[PDB]
A paper describes a structure:
[name],[name] ([name]) catalyzes the conversion of 4-diphosphocytidyl-[name]-phosphate to [name],4-cyclodiphosphate and cytidine monophosphate in production of isoprenoid-precursors via the methylerythritol phosphate biosynthetic pathway. [name] represents a potential target for development of broad-spectrum antimicrobial drugs since it is proven or inferred as essential in these pathogens and absent from mammals. The enzyme active site is located in a cleft at the interface of two subunits and here Zn2+ is coordinated by the side chains of two histidines and an aspartate.
However, citrate was present in the best crystallization conditions and the electron density maps were consistent with this molecule coordinating the metal ion and therefore complicating ligand-binding studies. The best-defined citrate binds to the active site Zn2+via both carboxylate and hydroxyl groups and this is also observed at one other site. The normally flexible and poorly ordered α2-α3 loop appears to lock down over the bound citrate adopting a configuration similar to that observed in the EcIspF-MEcPP complex. It is clear from these results, that any attempts to investigate ligand binding at the Zn2+ site will require crystallization conditions that do not include citrate.
Residue numbers in the entry:
A (entry chain A): 1 to 63, 74 to 159
B (entry chain C): 1 to 62, 70 to 159
C (entry chain B): 1 to 159
Write the structure that this text describes.
Amino acid sequence: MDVRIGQGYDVHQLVEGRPLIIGGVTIPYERGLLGHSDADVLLHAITDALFGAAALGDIGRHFDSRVLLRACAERVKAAGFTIQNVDSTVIAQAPKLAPHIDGMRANIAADLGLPLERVNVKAKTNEKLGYLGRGEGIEAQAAALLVKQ
Amino acid sequence: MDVRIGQGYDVHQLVEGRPLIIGGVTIPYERGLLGHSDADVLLHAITDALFGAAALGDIGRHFKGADSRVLLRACAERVKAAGFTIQNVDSTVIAQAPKLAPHIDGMRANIAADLGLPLERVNVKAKTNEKLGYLGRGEGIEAQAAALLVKQ
Amino acid sequence: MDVRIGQGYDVHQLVEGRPLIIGGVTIPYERGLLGHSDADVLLHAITDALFGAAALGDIGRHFSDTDAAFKGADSRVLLRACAERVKAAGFTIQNVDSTVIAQAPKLAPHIDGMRANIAADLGLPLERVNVKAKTNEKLGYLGRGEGIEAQAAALLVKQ
Ligand SMILES: [Zn+2]
Ligand SMILES: [Zn+2]
Ligand SMILES: [Zn+2]
């Protein structure tokens, strides 16, 4: 069985006057993530992990963060891989992410064609350290495992 | 073989009047890690990597005790009960001081004991942050972990 | 099948007067990474992911960062020695994935050169080696161009 690992990282600044969208869930908050796309740090980190596992390069090579994640899953499937699972962490000082985690997992699972039991998202703060601990930005990390057919 | 990956991250601030406990090892040092638990940054990241691979959420979603070895063992029991077995764990601790390398063996032996795994399936690595950022100024300590499971 | 995961992290400061070598690629730039060896952050993070998946400790356990032998060391030589220890311990490498994070210079145009070196060093085909490039969106020391971070993941199977 030809198993492959991938890992992803993303970070965006948080700014006034942008919606906060993470894992495709819009979360009520006075600030949101700055980027070219909707800046969805969590979907971007998972997309990178998936391309990384498939050795299809990265998000910048290929490319709604949902649309991108769905095109990523297509390209990975087309390259002959199946997705075993995704795990991820979002690091944000605020707001509270816990009540939105199930929604992110549902969006991710739909977009990757997986059952919910193969998708995990975890939330952390940065314990008031650094730009994350001060609310100036939000980070996501992801890991994915593929099997090549 | 139904293999699954998990990854974990944790960071705590260094403060006076706390012991420094990492990988269950008490490390002599003028400061220790701040949290509501014993703030064992390494055991927390590994615990999160293990729940993450089993798709059982995270430490937050779970476990009220301060002793992070008790939490790591309960983690292992939940993982086992969910039908998985652990292939291995690897991890990194980042601290500008003290030097962590002489303390790594003891963390390996604590984690191995708590997960019921032989030493050869348990790895801990030590890094500094090259005097960059809050880590590089000695203001806290970060750990990263990865774990692989097989659902049986 | 006895599969094992490894992960790696490294970060170095950018300073005047050093070459910039990442993934074994010399990149033209006014600053380079500072460390004991040539400070190749990406090879170091992959080297740590490889030792970590094989439970062989870490780069500092094998190549001391205060031993004169490794002052200015070409980090490809350490990567190749790491891969030989990992194979000798009974493992084959399934694949490596990695990310380099720098606000500057642009790293995306150099990814394919880094993959080529790493694949050659690990005795792997290109389709088992991946390197991704990111910026830090002007956040923190990485966002202000003060250093460059690398992250890696390696998957082994024990024979
Ligand atoms: Zn992004
Ligand atoms: Zn913690
Ligand atoms: Zn290094």
